[PDB]
A paper describes a structure:
We then determined the structure of the [name] pre-pore complex by single particle cryo-EM to an average resolution of 3.5 Å. However, in this initial 3D reconstruction the densities corresponding to LF represented a mixture of assemblies and were partly unassignable. This can be either due to the symmetry mismatch that emerges when three lethal factors bind simultaneously to PA7 or to possible different conformations of the individual LFs bound to PA7. To address these points, we established an image processing workflow that includes sequential 3-D classifications and rotation of classes. This resulted in three reconstructions with resolutions of 3.8 Å, 4.2 Å and 4.3 Å that differed in the position of the third LF bound to PA7 and the conformation of LF. The densities corresponding to the lethal factors in the 4.3 Å structure were not resolved well enough to allow the fitting of an atomic model (S2F). Therefore, we proceeded with the remaining two structures, combined the two particle stacks and masked out the density of the third LF to improve the resolution of the rest of the complex to 3.5 Å (S2H). The structures reveal that PA7 forms a seven-fold symmetric ring structure with a ~25 Å wide central opening. Noteworthy, the 2β2-2β3 loop region (residues 300–323) which is implicated in pore formation was not resolved in our map. The LF-PA interface is well resolved for all LFs and almost identical in the different structures.
During the early and late steps of infection with the Gram-positive bacterium [name], the tripartite anthrax toxin is secreted as major virulence factor in order to kill host immune cells such as macrophages or neutrophils. Like other AB-type toxins, it is composed of a surface binding/translocation moiety, the [name] (PA, 83 kDa), and two cytotoxic subunits, [name] (LF, 90 kDa) and edema factor (EF, 93 kDa). After cleavage by furin-like proteases, the truncated 63 kDa-sized PA monomer oligomerizes either into homo-heptamers (PA7) or homo-octamers (PA8). While PA8 can bind up to four factors, only three of them can simultaneously bind to PA7. Both enzymatic substrates bind to the upper rim of the PA oligomer via their N-terminal domains in a competitive manner.
Numbering used by the authors:
A (entry chain B), D (entry chain C): 175 to 274, 287 to 301, 323 to 734
B (entry chain H): 217 to 345, 368 to 773
C (entry chain I): 32 to 279
């Protein structure tokens, strides 16, 4: 039996379909039989008879499907047509400031993607704006910063691997940037210190250990991160930073046939492979799971190249099926309940043109029908986002239609004079910055309790996942008073897009010019 | 069928077949590479013209041999197909004395030794003219009324043509005719004109084993075969040897009612053979055949047994028999406690059902030990080895082995039956092929013969100088006069057979039989328990 | 590295289990195999045959009733031993008999095989050849060459204490007057010669003895059988039968 | 005979069952015969026909069972289905403090485990609170600490290997942490100095030598462990420190067939193997032996992976049998007398769900019955702790039900006016902080001798394991007086959980608000 690619599997099997199936204790490779394998829940593999690794990453077609492989490659990447490679970005948990009266705020970071969008990781941190201290109005004064002073920046970060394969020795160099181009610092690539592993969906260091301190705390530079006044001003007006990271990972862990040992070979290095993967696969970005950008690459054919025409034709439907988890309970593509029709398709200009052609030779207008007839070619970039939410320039979930917001609140488990304990779907509370509470006199007056832009963070989360809104937090540590059991109690929610991050022109602090959505309205009797 | 065939032929799927359907793979594996070349011939075997073309093709090669045939050769070949029945006028003219008048008024129909055809023969013989001296003259007469049948002599003697079991003149005649026939078959089948040639022969199951032949055919519908007995027949049928002259056909022809075996025999270019004008071939004697498969087939609404076979040098099969001889002797010398090198279970077989005889030894003895008190076996085996006696399993008639003829010394003293015990040689003989007219299986035949030996040793221990049995002692003859007729009619014959019959029954595998002997002959039971005590 | 695994792997992995009792039969048969067959035919021709018991050799019908006094035996190395513990005894009489206790360790170890071969050599020298007085001048000549030789520990290896004290060279009369000692020396040499691992020791310390036994087992044992057969009347008569028949 | 995994043992043998058995002096491998091997007390091994090492650690299926292996690997790990790997944690024996009049206290450490528990070793020290010196009330003053001062920390530590395999060259880096995230110091990884071996259940340096001094005593840093005042305050209120250690061990010792030499191969390093083990085995934690957390890993099947389905099915009962020593005298699982029913089973949320399923397809509710029918899958975490003791958040033994405490004392070997000499079960005296002694007037009065919160450590242990309570220790070096031969003498015991570690609000030192259990009460004449 011929086998040109020298990858264990014979040619015909690779072209037509095969599957590995365990017979009591021995595993053997078999040609796909329609009737005996389908009942057993086995996947029909296909691959290239002329490629030692159809995806082009460092694991052979045979190794992947057979399980002889670094046991850390994520499961969904075991299928021969899904490239397995790392994607490391940096997540900053909190910062602190002073001058070479310590501004200590918690931060939230999200992996970003913007638009002709290219293969380079960047993240984006947002510093909390809410006033942890009552008296700390205006940062410029809480820290004695003068026109001729300089502030020091000291943050905590952890690395997150959201890819599909482990990195071993190296940790990426990564540069912090404020504004458009003001590079404050480049985080050194520590040497011979990352002897641990970053498996997919893991943190370094783990959630159980102190996070890696950004400032060295040693003698390398007394304050490496100096920062002039004007810069500090820029930061105060924008409250946003960027973290750009490159692709310099370590070596690769390979499987040895003589004894099954996985040793990090010093010859193979990810910086030689990534270009290959990136130039021969179609890339699909999905924010379905938890509104975070998950990126996968599928091996598609490229007409111009002989060796490349060898790869099995890949239709979009299958791509979604094998890369993310879509299935067919009733033949309708859906991801854990949500039908495929609730998602957007966005394409780069190239891919757009190509798909318009494909839709023309078939005489169809709605791609959601002819979904299983769209051929993927190499280098297409596709963005599938939930259709219900509003988005900003960096494709981060930022808001939503008010009506959806209301349905998300229609389940009042209990109500009293001390607050609400709701049970809301975990995804909505990442596009709500806070709530405005107000009381209405029986004759139409309006009293807003937390009537300051930076006093909205009143919604905490209990250990049983029930959100609890506390009135006494930014009140006077006093219960909630009502001048009339007929006075209505109104609760409003403020979406991210409509929030204010700095005092206005004339330093207005009132919540007047804020687009507010009605979220609750029960009279005194109900409470 | 088609599906399995397809998966097996396609190289890449063969392994899948073997993994999920092991048995199917084995069947198809054996099917497509030897039997397949077979079934083609039978298809051709249905067309008249193919039969006639191959027959004619076979003719010319033997044309030269046929054209040179003399009168003596053809006359001999004539005698071989049709036996010559004995002529009454010759025997009558051969007696002429007082014995014939004496014979005149004898209770003919009272001799068990005679068979039906011999009773008929004597009854019509009496157109030319009891517990005494007349059955001995009848014993002699039996050795003179047998038909002149060369082929019968050849299986009965197993190829040992010098057997002094018959009158000397007949012996010279037989040796001469067979040697002349041996000279006649000088042409080998070998040619450049033809490859594998298959020939056929229809055979009656009763010729190989009358024990299986009685229940082979379904009791209700004679067109079906009972699968249970079939599996037994097939179990250990692995090789066979033909010592006599095979009379084979060329084209399959319909068989008679009593022929249920349809042999397909392949030949070797070196096998010597003769051509017959009547579409038959005469093969040389002393041919060895290995059986490749045994199956049930259907033809014209009736069931049959298909048996194939391949001709090979007899020596190759003979080696199997000696190695079997060594395996059984080494195993039982250890199991009994006998000297390491003893020749005890020697068996010599030259017939069609050989392999079953050998394998059946490994069963008769297993049933023999587990059923008899260990100390009796050991003691009697010790007695037997103290002399030159050996057990002997054969597939030829008992009168031709070696030991039996020598010690009796009279020509007429010959006896043939299912089993036999020779005191002079202290040997037990078990003839497998025949079926006991009484016994249910072979094991019982063995135990019966064993009884005669035990009786001899038991009698030997009482006094060393005198040779006598436990019976003949006045303390047992009387016992035979009272209870002797309370069991089977066969044992009523005399004391020796009675003792043997009682011994098997007291040791039968069915406890019910034991109880029967308990409640029917209470005295004998304590007597037997008293002779076996001597240990 | 992959090469070595194979040999150790094979030595350790018994593919199938022979069985609980088969091993015993296979062990004994392999042991008796190494002795030249012609010795076995000579033994059978003179009568009794070797039977392998399984239990305590001290209690067997053939030996319990005879030679009760000789409970003291000396192994090949000269150390005493009691018959019950010993794993092989033999007896010379009207019925020459040899009894061996079955065990599973005759192929694996060697010290037990040496005692068995020693007993076969003792049967050979005392019971077979003695009927023809085969040990004679050639054997005496090698024997004599061993006593007088440069610091040859060979004596220590084959001679008992009784021999180391005969001052002069060996004499043909002595063998006649004393015939147990010489037959013993013969047996020892025979034993050391058959066992592969001890063969080298023999040739090393008693060269002439090794040469003698080598030519003896090589081409001087068929003559033993033929000459023994020349005593049997029936052998002579079968011989006449065959010769007269063929050329008749 | 085929043999794909190339591990010496043939396929059929590995799948069906085999065993190694020494025949007088030669060792041979045999297929398991049920009747002839069982009487000899031989174990029935099973393994994977497609894995050179079923556990996935660096010793072949063949090497483990045959004994050709580093003779240091612990016995329980010789069985082919139990992973052999190291588990190193740091034990601190005592500390000392001063200012850049030195408080030198002995400490006790316990290897910890807390809850969603992850694969990283950490320990926890507790500093003795009892007053060694009478006059040393309030640490803040015994050391002349000022608002603008800094204290120096100097401790002694030893490394403990509680795993099942040896480490060779390296010794792990480990960082001390006070509070939630305040890292005081990271103990350097000394270089080319741990040339000795840490066999399982051993200390480095051995118990017979001085422990490795934490402070260098050289010129590297004058006081590496600086610590601001506020830090010192947290420490004074809590007396707890955490020791987090990572997994950077050395190389691996391999067996050479040519000469039987065990050489440390510089290519293979435990930091490449541990991930494999950690992703393909079920982990069982047991505190049965001496109330210490012993962790073992057993090789279990993982349905999703072909090669992995090859491993023998593992039932919980057998796992406990082969990993820890449980046996069946009468068919009832037990560990040295204690029936299996005296233990709790706690499971991580995943494993919990999975086992609930397993209990559903069998229609049973009490797992203690159906124990031999529970299948183990990869990645389960199971925690088996003694049911009789109360536990804290870090699963350390901390208390117990009063009835057990009283029953543990019903054997009074001797009683006099100078103290008790008891013989108690070695495990209980690890949850008792001390005893309060009091004398009772014939009319109900109450006089507590050692009436101070920090005066409880009065129970010593004699060299024959007999506990001796000394009254004169925290008395006035005077015997015990009794105002009436009819007066009862009462003794109470205080378990750790109910102890106080700092003076109260108004600095109360009296044992008033302490939950005390009566342990003894004999009249004056019954002594």
């Amino acid at each position: 039996v011929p086998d040109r690619d020298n990858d264990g599997i014979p040619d015909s099997l690779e072209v037509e379909g095969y599957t590995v199936d365990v017979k009591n204790k021995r595993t053997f490779l078999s040609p796909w039989i329609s009737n005996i394998h389908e009942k057993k829940g086995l996947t029909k593999y296909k691959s290239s008879p002329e490629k030692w690794s159809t995806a082009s990453d460092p694991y052979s077609d045979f190794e992947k499907v057979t399980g002889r492989i670094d046991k850390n490659v994520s499961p969904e990447a075991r299928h021969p047509l899904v490239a397995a490679y790392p994607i490391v970005h940096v997540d900053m948990e909190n910062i602190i400031l002073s001058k070479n009266r310590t501004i200590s705020k918690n931060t939230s970071t999200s992996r970003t993607h913007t638009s002709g969008f290219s293969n380079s990781n960047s993240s984006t941190v947002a510093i909390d704006h809410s006033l942890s201290l009552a008296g700390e109005r205006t940062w410029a004064e809480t820290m004695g910063l003068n026109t001729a002073d300089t502030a020091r920046l000291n943050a905590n970060i952890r690395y997150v691997n959201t890819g599909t394969a482990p990195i071993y020795n190296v940790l990426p160099t990564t540069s912090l940037v404020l504004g458009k181009n003001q590079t404050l610092a480049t985080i050194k690539a520590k040497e011979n210190q990352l002897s641990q592993i970053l498996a997919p969906n893991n943190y370094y260091p783990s959630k159980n250990l102190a996070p890696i301190a950004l400032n060295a705390q040693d003698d390398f530079s007394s304050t490496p991160i100096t920062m002039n006044y004007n810069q500090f001003l820029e930061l105060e007006k924008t409250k946003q930073l960027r973290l750009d990271t490159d692709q310099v990972y370590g070596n690769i862990a390979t499987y040895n046939f003589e004894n099954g040992r996985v040793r990090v070979d010093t010859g193979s290095n990810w910086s030689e492979v990534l270009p290959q993967i990136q130039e021969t696969t179609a890339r699909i970005i999905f924010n379905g799971k938890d509104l975070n950008l998950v990126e996968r690459r599928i091996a598609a054919v490229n007409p111009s190249d002989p060796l490349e025409t060898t790869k099995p034709d890949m239709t979009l439907k299958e791509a979604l099926k094998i890369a993310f988890g879509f299935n067919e309970p009733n033949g309708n593509l859906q991801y854990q309940g949500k039908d495929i029709t609730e998602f957007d398709f966005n394409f780069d200009q190239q891919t757009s043109q190509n798909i318009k052609n494909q839709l023309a030779e078939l005489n169809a207008t709605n791609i959601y029908t002819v979904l299983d007839k769209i051929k993927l070619n190499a280098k297409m970039n596709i963005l599938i986002r939930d259709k219900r939410f509003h988005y900003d320039r960096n494709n981060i979930a930022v808001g939503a239609d008010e009506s959806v917001v209301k349905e998300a609140h229609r389940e009042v488990i209990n109500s009293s004079t001390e607050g609400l304990l709701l049970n809301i779907d975990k995804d909505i509370r990442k596009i709500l910055s806070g709530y405005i509470v107000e009381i209405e006199d029986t004759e139409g007056l309006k009293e807003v309790i937390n009537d300051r832009y930076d006093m909205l963070n009143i919604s905490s989360l209990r250990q049983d996942g029930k959100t609890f809104i506390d009135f006494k937090k930014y009140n006077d540590k006093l219960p909630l008073y009502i001048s009339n059991p007929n006075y209505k109690v109104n609760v409003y929610a403020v979406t991210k897009e409509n929030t204010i991050i700095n005092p206005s022109e004339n330093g207005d602090t009132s919540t007047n010019g804020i687009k507010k959505i009605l979220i609750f309205s029960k009279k005194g009797y109900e409470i | 069928f088609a599906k399995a065939f397809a998966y097996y032929i396609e190289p890449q799927h063969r392994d899948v077949l073997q993994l999920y359907a092991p048995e199917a793979f084995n069947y198809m594996d054996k099917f497509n590479e030897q039997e397949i070349n077979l079934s083609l011939e039978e298809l051709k075997d249905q067309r008249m013209l193919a039969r006639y073309e191959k027959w004619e093709k076979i003719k010319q090669h033997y044309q030269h041999w046929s054209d040179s045939l003399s009168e003596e050769g053809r006359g001999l070949l004539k005698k071989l197909q049709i036996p010559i029945e004995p002529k009454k006028d010759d025997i009558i003219h051969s007696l002429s004395q007082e014995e014939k008048e004496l014979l005149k008024r004898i209770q003919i129909d009272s001799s068990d030794f005679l068979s039906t055809e011999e009773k008929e023969f004597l009854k019509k013989l009496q157109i030319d003219i009891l517990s005494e001296k007349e059955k001995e003259f009848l014993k002699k007469l039996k050795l003179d009324i047998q038909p002149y049948d060369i082929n019968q002599r050849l299986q009965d003697t197993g190829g040992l043509i010098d057997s002094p079991s018959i009158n000397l003149d007949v012996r010279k005649q037989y040796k001469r005719d067979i040697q002349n026939i041996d000279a006649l078959l000088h042409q080998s089948i070998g040619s450049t004109l033809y490859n594998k040639i298959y020939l056929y022969e229809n055979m009656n199951i009763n010729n190989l084993t009358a024990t299986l032949g009685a229940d082979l055919v379904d009791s209700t519908d004679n067109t079906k075969i009972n699968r249970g007995i079939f599996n037994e027949f097939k179990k250990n049928f692995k090789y066979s040897i033909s010592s006599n002259y095979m009379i084979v056909d060329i084209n399959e022809r319909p068989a008679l009612d009593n022929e249920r075996l349809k042999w397909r025999i392949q030949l070797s270019p070196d096998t010597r053979a003769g051509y017959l004008e009547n579409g038959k071939l005469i093969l040389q004697r002393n041919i060895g055949l290995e059986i490749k498969d045994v199956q049930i087939i259907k033809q014209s609404e009736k069931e049959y047994i298909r048996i194939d076979a391949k001709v090979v040098p007899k020596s190759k099969i003979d080696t199997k028999i000696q190695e079997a001889q060594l395996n059984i002797n080494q195993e039982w010398n250890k199991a009994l406690g006998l000297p390491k090198y003893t020749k005890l279970i020697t068996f010599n077989v030259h017939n069609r059902y050989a392999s079953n005889i050998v394998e059946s030894a490994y069963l008769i003895l297993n049933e023999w030990k587990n059923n008899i008190q260990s100390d009796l076996i050991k003691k009697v085996t010790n007695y037997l080895v103290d002399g030159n006696g050996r057990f002997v399993f054969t597939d030829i008639t008992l009168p031709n082995i070696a030991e039996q003829y020598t010690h009796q010394d009279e020509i007429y003293e010959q006896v043939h039956s299912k089993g036999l015990y020779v005191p002079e040689s202290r040997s037990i003989l078990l003839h497998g092929p025949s079926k006991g007219v009484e016994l249910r299986n072979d094991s019982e035949g063995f135990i019966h013969e064993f009884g005669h030996a035990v009786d001899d040793y038991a009698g030997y221990l009482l006094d060393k100088n005198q040779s006598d049995l436990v019976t003949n002692s006045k303390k047992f003859i009387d016992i035979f006069k009272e209870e002797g007729s309370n069991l089977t009619s066969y044992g009523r014959t005399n004391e020796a057979e009675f003792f043997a019959e009682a011994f098997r029954l007291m040791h039968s595998t069915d406890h019910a039989e034991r109880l029967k002997v308990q409640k029917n002959a209470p005295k004998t039971f304590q007597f037997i328990n008293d002779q076996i005590k001597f240990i | 590295q992959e090469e070595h695994l194979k040999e150790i792997m094979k030595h350790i992995v018994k593919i199938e289990v022979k069985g609980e009792e088969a091993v015993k039969k296979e062990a004994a048969e392999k042991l008796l195999e190494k002795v030249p067959s012609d010795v076995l035919e000579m033994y059978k021709a003179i009568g009794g045959k070797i039977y392998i018991v399984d239990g305590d050799i001290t209690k067997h019908i053939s030996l319990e009733a005879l030679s009760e006094d000789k409970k003291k035996i000396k192994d090949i190395y000269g150390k005493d031993a009691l018959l019950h513990e010993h794993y092989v005894y033999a007896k010379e009489g009207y019925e020459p008999v040899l009894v061996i206790q079955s065990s599973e360790d005759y192929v694996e170890n060697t010290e037990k095989a040496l005692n068995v071969y020693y007993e076969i050599g003792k049967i050979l020298s005392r019971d077979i050849l003695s009927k023809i007085n085969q040990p004679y001048q050639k054997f005496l000549d090698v024997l004599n060459t061993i006593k007088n030789a440069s610091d040859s520990d060979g004596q220590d290896l084959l001679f008992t204490n009784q021999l180391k004290e005969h001052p002069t060279d060996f004499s043909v009369e002595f063998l006649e007057q004393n015939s147990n000692e010489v037959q013993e020396v013969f047996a020892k040499a025979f034993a050391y010669y058959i066992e592969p691992q001890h063969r080298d020791v023999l040739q090393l310390y008693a060269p002439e003895a090794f040469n003698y036994m080598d030519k003896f087992n090589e081409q001087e044992i068929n003559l033993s059988l033929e000459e023994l057969k020349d005593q049997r009347m029936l052998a002579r008569y079968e011989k006449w039968e065959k010769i007269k028949q063929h050329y008749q």
